[PDB]
Amino acid sequence: ALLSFERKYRVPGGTLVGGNLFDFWVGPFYVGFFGVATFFFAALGIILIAWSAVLQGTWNPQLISVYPPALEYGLGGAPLAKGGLWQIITICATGAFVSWALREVEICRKLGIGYHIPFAFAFAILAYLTLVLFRPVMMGAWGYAFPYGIWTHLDWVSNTGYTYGNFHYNPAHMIAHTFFFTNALALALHGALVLSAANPEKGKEMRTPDHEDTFFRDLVGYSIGTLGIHRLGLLLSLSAVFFSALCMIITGTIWFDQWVDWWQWWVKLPWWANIPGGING
Amino acid sequence: AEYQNIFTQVQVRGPADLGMTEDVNLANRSGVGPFSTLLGWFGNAQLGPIYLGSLGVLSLFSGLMWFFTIGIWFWYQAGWNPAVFLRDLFFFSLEPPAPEYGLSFAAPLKEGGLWLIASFFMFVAVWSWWGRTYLRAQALGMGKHTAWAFLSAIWLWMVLGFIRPILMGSWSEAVPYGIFSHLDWTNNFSLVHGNLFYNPFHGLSIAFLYGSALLFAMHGATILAVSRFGGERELEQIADRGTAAERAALFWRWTMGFNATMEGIHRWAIWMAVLVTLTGGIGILLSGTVVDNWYVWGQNHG
Amino acid sequence: FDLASLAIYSFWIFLAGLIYYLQTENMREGYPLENEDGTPAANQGPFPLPKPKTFILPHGRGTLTVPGPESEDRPIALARTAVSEGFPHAPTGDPMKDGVGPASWVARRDLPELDGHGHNKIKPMKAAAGFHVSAGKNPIGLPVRGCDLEIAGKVVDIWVDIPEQMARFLEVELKDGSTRLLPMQMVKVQSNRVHVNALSSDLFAGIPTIKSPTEVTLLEEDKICGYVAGGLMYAAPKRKS
Ligand code: BCL
Ligand code: BCL
Ligand code: BCL
Ligand code: BCL
Ligand SMILES: CC[C@H]1c2cc3[nH]c4c(c3C)C(=O)[C@H](C(=O)OC)c4c3nc(cc4[nH]c(cc(n2)[C@@H]1C)c(C(C)=O)c4C)[C@@H](C)[C@@H]3CCC(=O)OC/C=C(/C)CCC[C@@H](C)CCC[C@@H](C)CCCC(C)C
Ligand SMILES: CC[C@H]1c2cc3[nH]c4c(c3C)C(=O)[C@H](C(=O)OC)c4c3nc(cc4[nH]c(cc(n2)[C@@H]1C)c(C(C)=O)c4C)[C@@H](C)[C@@H]3CCC(=O)OC/C=C(\C)CCC[C@@H](C)CCC[C@@H](C)CCCC(C)C
Ligand SMILES: COC(C)(C)C(=O)C/C=C(\C)CC/C=C(\C)CC/C=C(\C)CCCC/C(C)=C/CC[C@H](C)CC/C=C(\C)CCC=C(C)C
Ligand SMILES: CCCCCCCCCCCC[N+](C)(C)[O-]
Ligand SMILES: CCCCCCCCCCCC[N+](C)(C)[O-]
Ligand SMILES: CCCCCCCCCCCC[N+](C)(C)[O-]
Numbered sequence: 061a062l063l064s065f066e067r068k069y070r071v072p073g074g075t076l077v078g079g080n081l082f083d084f085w086v087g088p089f090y091v092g093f094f095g096v097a098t099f100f101f102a103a104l105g106i107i108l109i110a111w112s113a114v115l116q117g118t119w120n121p122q123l124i125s126v127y128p129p130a131l132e133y134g135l136g137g138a139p140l141a142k143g144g145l146w147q148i149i150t151i152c153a154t155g156a157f158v159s160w161a162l163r164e165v166e167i168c169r170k171l172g173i174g175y176h177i178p179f180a181f182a183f184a185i186l187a188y189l190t191l192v193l194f195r196p197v198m199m200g201a202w203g204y205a206f207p208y209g210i211w212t213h214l215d216w217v218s219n220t221g222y223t224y225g226n227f228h229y230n231p232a233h234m235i236a237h238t239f240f241f242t243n244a245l246a247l248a249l250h251g252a253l254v255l256s257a258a259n260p261e262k263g264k265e266m267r268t269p270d271h272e273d274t275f276f277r278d279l280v281g282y283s284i285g286t287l288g289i290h291r292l293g294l295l296l297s298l299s300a301v302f303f304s305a306l307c308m309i310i311t312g313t314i315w316f317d318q319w320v321d322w323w324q325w326w327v328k329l330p331w332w333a334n335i336p337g338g339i340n341g
Numbered sequence: 342a343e344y345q346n347i348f349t350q351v352q353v354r355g356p357a358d359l360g361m362t363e364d365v366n367l368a369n370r371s372g373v374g375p376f377s378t379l380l381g382w383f384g385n386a387q388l389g390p391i392y393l394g395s396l397g398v399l400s401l402f403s404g405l406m407w408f409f410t411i412g413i414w415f416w417y418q419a420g421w422n423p424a425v426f427l428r429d430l431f432f433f434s435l436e437p438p439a440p441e442y443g444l445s446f447a448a449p450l451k452e453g454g455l456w457l458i459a460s461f462f463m464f465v466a467v468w469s470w471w472g473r474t475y476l477r478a479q480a481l482g483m484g485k486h487t488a489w490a491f492l493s494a495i496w497l498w499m500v501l502g503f504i505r506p507i508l509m510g511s512w513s514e515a516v517p518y519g520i521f522s523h524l525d526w527t528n529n530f531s532l533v534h535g536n537l538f539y540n541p542f543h544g545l546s547i548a549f550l551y552g553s554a555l556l557f558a559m560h561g562a563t564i565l566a567v568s569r570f571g572g573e574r575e576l577e578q579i580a581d582r583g584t585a586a587e588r589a590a591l592f593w594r595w596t597m598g599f600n601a602t603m604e605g606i607h608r609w610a611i612w613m614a615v616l617v618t619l620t621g622g623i624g625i626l627l628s629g630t631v632v633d634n635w636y637v638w639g640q641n642h643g
Numbered sequence: 644f645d646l647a648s649l650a651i652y653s654f655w656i657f658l659a660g661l662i663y664y665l666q667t668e669n670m671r672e673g674y675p676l677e678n679e680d681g682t683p684a685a686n687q688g689p690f691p692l693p694k695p696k697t698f699i700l701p702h703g704r705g706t707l708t709v710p711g712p713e714s715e716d717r718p719i720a721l722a723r724t725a726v727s728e729g730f731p732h733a734p735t736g737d738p739m740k741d742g743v744g745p746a747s748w749v750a751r752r753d754l755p756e757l758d759g760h761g762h763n764k765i766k767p768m769k770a771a772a773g774f775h776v777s778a779g780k781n782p783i784g785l786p787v788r789g790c791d792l793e794i795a796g797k798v799v800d801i802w803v804d805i806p807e808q809m810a811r812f813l814e815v816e817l818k819d820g821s822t823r824l825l826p827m828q829m830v831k832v833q834s835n836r837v838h839v840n841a842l843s844s845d846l847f848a849g850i851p852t853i854k855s856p857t858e859v860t861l862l863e864e865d866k867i868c869g870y871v872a873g874g875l876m877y878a879a880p881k882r883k884s
C-alpha cells in the first residue's frame with residue numbers, strides 16, 4: 061500500500077517523543093508514539109464503553125449510554141456503574157484526542173508542512189472539553205455534562221437548552237450560529253467555483269483563477285481570492301466553534317436565568333424606556 | 342514567530358483588473374470600485390467591477406422593494422417614532438394571513454396582505470438572482486455548479502415560504518419577517534411537531550452542517566499548511582500536480598487512512614454543504630404534510 | 644410504508660452511491676497503489692479506478708487525462724532501512740540536494756504558469772507594469788537572515804502574481820552577486836530585516852536557481868519551495884531558538 065508518489069516522502073525524522081522507536085507505518089497509517097498513545101486511550105475507552113453496556117444490560121448502539129455521576133457526587137469520583145465509568149472514559153477520550161492532535165503535529169513535521177490542521181483540531185477538542193470539563197468544574201458537578209449515547213445526548217441538549225427558555229436568545233449562540241451558516245455558504249460557493257472552473261462547458265478549455273475572480277466580481281461586485289477563501293473557511297469554522305464554547309461557558313455560570321430576558325438591557329435604556337407606543341409599552 | 346499566512350505581510354497593487362471577457366457584454370460591467378487596504382490583509386483589495394444587466398437590475402430592485410415593505414410596517418408598528426423604532430427593532434414583525442384566509446390573496450393589508458406583497462417581491466428577487474448566477478457562468482464558459490448549488494439553498498426557502506404553505510392549505514404556516522419573531526416561529530415549529538430532534542432529516546441536516554464546518558476547517562487549514570508550495574493555486578495543481586498537492590494528500594492518508602485529490606476535495610466540499618439544505622428541506626416539507634409528530638413517527642417506523 | 648419511511652431509505656441508498664462516486668472521483672491521482680519497490684501492490688482496496696476524463700488545458704498546452712500511467716519521472720535517492728513493508732527509507736545522499744523527504748519536489752512542467760491572457764503569472768515587480776508595494780513594510784533592500792542568525796543576503800525585488808495581485812517571492816542576492824527566490828510564506832518581514840527560519844545562512848547558495856532571470860517555471864517553483872521547506876528538518880543542526 062503506497063500512493064505512486066509516496067515513497068520519496070517516507071523518510072525518517074519528525075517525531076516529538078521516542079526518537080525513532082515508533083517511527084514507522086502500518087498500511088496507510090503513520091504510527092508515532094502518539095499513534096500508540098492514541099490506540100491505547102482509544103481501545104481502553106471502547107472497552108469500558110462495551111462493559112458499561114453490560115452493567116447497563118444492553119447490546120444496541122441506539123440504547124447504550126454512559127451517564128455522568130449525578131449532581132450529588134459533586135466534583136468527586138463515583139462507583140463505576142453509576143458514574144465512574146463516564147469519568148474514566150472521559151479521561152480516555154481526552155487522551156485519545158490530544159494524542160491524535162500531537163500525532164498530526166508529527167506527520168506535519170515529517171512532511172515539511174505547517175501546523176494549521178492540528179491547530180484547527182485543537183478548537184474542536186476545546187469545544188468538547190468546555191462541555192465535559194470546563195463547564196461542569198465551574199458549575200460544581202460532572203452531572204451537568206452530556207452523557208455518551210446517540211439519542212440520549214440529544215436529550216441533554218434539549219433539556220439544557222430549555223432550562224434557559226428558547227436558547228436562540230443566547231447572544232453568543234446567536235453569533236456562533238451565524239458563523240455555522242456562513243461557513244456552509246462559503247463551502248458551497250468555494251467548491252462550486254473551483255469545479256465550475258476545472259469542468260467548463262463541453263469542449264471548452266479549463267478556466268483560470270482570473271475567470272474565478274471575474275465570475276464573482278460580476279456576480280456580487282467582489283472577489284476574495286484563492287488565498288482569501290482558504291483563510292476564510294478556516295476563520296468561519298474556527299469562529300463558529302469558538303463562539304459555541306463561549307455561548308455555553310457563560311450559561312449556568314454568569315447567566316442562569318431565561319435568555320430572552322437578557323435583551324431587556326437594551327429596551328430599558330434611559331432615553332427610550334418610557335416612551336409610549338411600539339411593542340414595549 | 343514563524344509566519345503562518347493568516348494575514349498578509351506586504352500588500353502589492355497594480356493596475357485595476359477589469360477581468361476576463363469571453364462572451365460577457367462589457368457594456369453592462371461597471372467601473373472599478375475603490376481599493377480596501379483593510380480587506381487587503383485577508384484577501385483581495387479590489388472592490389468591483391460588477392455586472393448589472395436587466396435581470397440583475399430587476400433583482401436588485403425587487404429585493405429592496407421586499408426590504409422596504411418590511412421596514413415601513415416596522416415604522417408603522419413603532420408609531421413613526423425614531424426612538425421606539427430603534428428600541429424595539431428586533432421585536433417588530435410582519436406576520437402572514439391568519440389561518441382563515443386560506444391560500445387566498447383576499448386578506449386585508451394590515452393583516453398579512455402586506456406580508457404577501459413583500460413575499461412576492463422576495464420570490465422575484467431570489468429567482469431572478471438565481472438565473473443571474475447561471476448566466477454569469479454561461480458568459481464565461483464555466484460549469485453550472487454555482488447555480489446548481491444555489492438551487493439547493495433555494496429548495497429550503499421555497500419549502501418554508503411557498504411549497505409547505507401551499508400543501509398545508511394556508512399562508513399562516515410561513516415564516517414571518519422579523520428578527521426575534523422568526524426565531525420564535527422556529528421554536529414553535531419544533532413543539533407543534535413532536536420535536537424535530539426526531540426528524541431523521543433534521544439529524545442529517547445537522548450532520549452535514551457540522552460536517553461543513555469540519556471539512557472547510559480541515560481543507561482551509563490543509564491549503565494554508567501547503568501554501569509554502571503554492572497550494573492555493575488549486576486549478577494548476579489539478580492540471581499538473583505539485584509537491585503541494587502531494588504532501589496534502591499524504592498528511593491525510595497518513596493520519597486517517599485515505600485521502601483526496603486537489604480536484605476531488607472540492608466535490609467533497611460542494612456535496613457536504615449542499616446536503617445541509619437538501620435533507621433540511623425534505624425534513625421540513627414532510628413535517629405537517631405527512632408526519633404530525635416526529636416522536637410518534639419515531640416509535641412506529643423506526 | 645408511509646412517505647417519510649420511503650424518503651429516508653431512499654436517501655441512505657443515494658448517500659452510499661454518492662460516497663462511492665466521491666471516493667472513485669478522488670482516485671484519479673496516485674493510483675493504482677504500489678509496493679515500496681514500484682510494482683503494482685497486490686491489494687488496491689474496495690474501490691475501482693474511474694473512467695478516464697480529459698482536461699483541455701488552455702493556451703494550447705495540451706491535455707491531461709486521469710487516471711493515467713504514472714511515474715515519478717525522476718531518480719529517488721533513498722534506500723530501505725528494514726527487511727519488510729512499512730519502515731522509513733534512508734537518504735542515500737544529501738536529502739536537500741537530492742530533493743527527498745521534506746525537501747521533495749515534483750517533476751512538474753518546465754514552463755511558467757500563465758494568466759488568463761497567456762502572459763506569465765509571476766513576474767519580478769520591476770518588470771510588472773504599474774505594480775508597487777501598497778501596505779505594510781516594503782521588504783526590498785532589507786538584509787536577509789538565516790536561522791543560524793547570520794546574514795545570508797539582501798532583498799532586491801518582490802516577485803508578484805499579476806492576476807491575483809499578491810507577493811509570491813522575495814528575490815534575494817547572495818554574497819557572490821547571484822540571486823535566489825524565497826517563498827513569501829516562509830519569510831518573516833521585520834522592521835529592520837527579513838528573517839528566514841527554515842534555512843541557515845550557509846544553505847542559501849544550495850537553493851535551486853532559475854534559468855531565465857525574469858520568469859519562473861512550475862518545475863522551478865517546486866524545486867525552490869521544496870528545498871526551503873526541507874530546511875526545517877535538515878537545517879536543525881544550525882537553528883538556535
Ligand atoms: C434555520 C431555521 C430558521 C433560522 C434560524 C436562525 C437562527 C437560529 C439564527 C438566525 C439568525 C439570522 N437569520 Mg434566520 N433562520 C432562517 C432563515 C432565515 C432567512 C431566510 C431567507 O430564510 C433569513 C433572511 C434569515 C435571517 C437571519 C438573520 C437575522 C440572522 C443572520 C443570517 C445568517 O447567519 O446567515 C448567513 C448570511 C450572510 C452571511 C449574509 C448576510 C445576511 C444579512 C444579515 C442580511 C439579512 C437581512 C437582515 C434580516 C437585516 C437586519 C436588520 C437590520 C438591523 C436593519 N434567517 C430559518 C427559517 N436564523 C441569527 C441571529 O442572530 O438572529 C437574530 C441566529 O441566531
Ligand atoms: C433545544 C436545543 C436548543 C439549543 C441549545 C444548545 C445547546 C444546549 C448547545 C447548543 C450548541 C450549539 N447550537 Mg444550539 N440549540 C438550539 C438551536 C440551534 C440552532 C437552530 C437553527 O435552531 C442551531 C443552528 C444551533 C447551533 C448550535 C451551535 C452554536 C452549537 C453546536 C455546534 C458545536 O458547538 O460544536 C462543537 C463541536 C464539538 C463539541 C465536537 C467535538 C469533536 C471532538 C473534539 C472529537 C470527536 C471525536 C469522536 C470520538 C469521533 C469518533 C471518530 C470515528 C470513530 C471515526 N442551535 C435549540 C434552541 N445549542 C452547543 C454548543 O454551543 O457547544 C459548545 C451546546 O452545548
Ligand atoms: C455539538 C453540540 C452537541 C451535539 C449535538 C448534536 C445534534 C443536535 C445532533 C448531533 C448528531 C450527531 N452527533 Mg452530537 N453533539 C455533541 C457532541 C458530539 C460528539 C462529541 C464527542 O463531542 C460526538 C462524537 C457526536 C456525534 C454525533 C453523531 C452521532 C451525529 C452526527 C454528527 C456529525 O455528523 O458531525 C460532523 C462529523 C462528521 C461528519 C464526522 C463523522 C463523525 C461520526 C459520524 C460520529 C461518530 C460517533 C459514533 C457513532 C459513536 C462514537 C463512539 C465510538 C464507539 C468510538 N456529537 C454535543 C453535545 N449532535 C445528530 C444526530 O443525528 O444524532 C442522533 C444531531 O441531530
Ligand atoms: C428549538 C428549535 C428546534 C429547531 C428547529 C428548526 C427548524 C424549524 C428548522 C431547523 C432547521 C435546521 N436546524 Mg434545527 N432546531 C433545533 C435545534 C438545532 C440544533 C441544535 C444544536 O440542537 C442545530 C445544530 C440545528 C440546526 C439546524 C440546521 C441544520 C437546519 C437549518 C438548515 C440551514 O442551513 O438553513 C439555512 C438556509 C436557508 C434558510 C436557505 C435560504 C436561502 C435563501 C434563498 C436566501 C435568501 C436571501 C435573502 C434575500 C437575504 C439577502 C441579504 C443579502 C445580504 C443581500 N437545529 C430545535 C430542535 N431547525 C431547518 C431545517 O431544514 O430543518 C430540518 C428548519 O426549517
Ligand atoms: C445550502 C448552503 C448555504 C447557501 C448556499 C448558497 N447561497 C447563495 C448561493 C449559494 C450556493 C449563491 O450562489 C447566492 C449568491 O449570490 O452567493 C453569494 C446565495 C445567496 N444566499 C444569500 C443569503 C443567505 N444564504 C443562507 C444560507 C445558505 N445558502 C446555506 C447555508 C442564508 C441563511 C442562513 O439564512 C442567507 C441569508 C445571499 C447572499 C444570496 C442570495 C441573494 C438573493 O436572492 O438576492 C436578493 C437581492 C437583493 C437585492 C436584496 C437586498 C436587500 C437588503 C438586505 C439590502 C440592505 C441595504 C440597505 C441598508 C441600504 C438602503 C439604501 C437605499 C437608500 C438605496
Ligand atoms: C474546529 C472546527 C470543526 C472540527 C475540526 C476538526 N476535526 C477534526 C480535525 C479538525 C481540524 C482533524 O484533524 C481530525 C481528523 O482526523 O479529521 C478527519 C478531526 C476529527 N473530528 C472528528 C469528529 C467530529 N468533529 C466535529 C466538529 C468539528 N471538528 C468542528 C465543527 C464533530 C461534531 C460537530 O460533533 C465530530 C463528531 C473526527 C472525525 C476526527 C477526530 C478523530 C480522533 O480524534 O480520533 C481519535 C479517537 C478515536 C478513534 C476514538 C475515541 C473513542 C473513545 C475515547 C470513546 C468515545 C468518546 C465519547 C466522547 C463518545 C461520544 C458519544 C456520542 C454519541 C455523543
Ligand atoms: C431605516 O428604515 C428603512 C425604512 C430605511 C428600512 O428599510 C429598514 C428596514 C428594516 C429594518 C427591515 C429589516 C428586515 C428584516 C428584519 C427581515 C427579516 C426576515 C427574515 C428573518 C427572513 C426569514 C425567512 C423568510 C422566508 C422563509 C421566506 C419565504 C419566502 C417565500 C419562498 C416566498 C413566498 C411567495 C409568496 C407568499 C407570494 C406568492 C404569490 C405569487 C403570485 C408567486
Ligand atoms: C433540487 C436540488 C438539486 C441539487 C443537485 C445537486 C447539484 C450539485 C452539483 C453536482 C455537479 C454535477 N453537475 C450536474 C453540475 O454536473
Ligand atoms: C458526505 C459525507 C458524509 C458524512 C455523513 C455522516 C452520517 C451521519 C449519520 C448521523 C445519523 C442521522 N440520523 C438521525 C438519521 O440517524
Ligand atoms: C446505487 C445507486 C444509487 C444512485 C446514487 C448515485 C449518486 C449520484 C452522484 C452524482 C453524479 C454526478 N455526475 C456524474 C453527474 O457528475
Ligand SMILES: CCCCCCCCCCCC[N+](C)(C)[O-]
Nearest residue numbers: 088598599662666687688689690
Ligand atoms: C464520511 C467519511 C466516509 C469514509 C469512508 C471512506 C472509505 C475509505 C476507502 C478508501 C480506500 C483506502 N485505501 C487505503 C484502501 O486506498
Ligand SMILES: [Cl-]
Nearest residue numbers: 345346347348
Ligand atoms: Cl500570520
Ligand SMILES: [Fe+3]
Nearest residue numbers: 250254564575
Ligand atoms: Fe480549495
Ligand SMILES: [K+]
Nearest residue numbers: 768771773774
Ligand atoms: K512596477
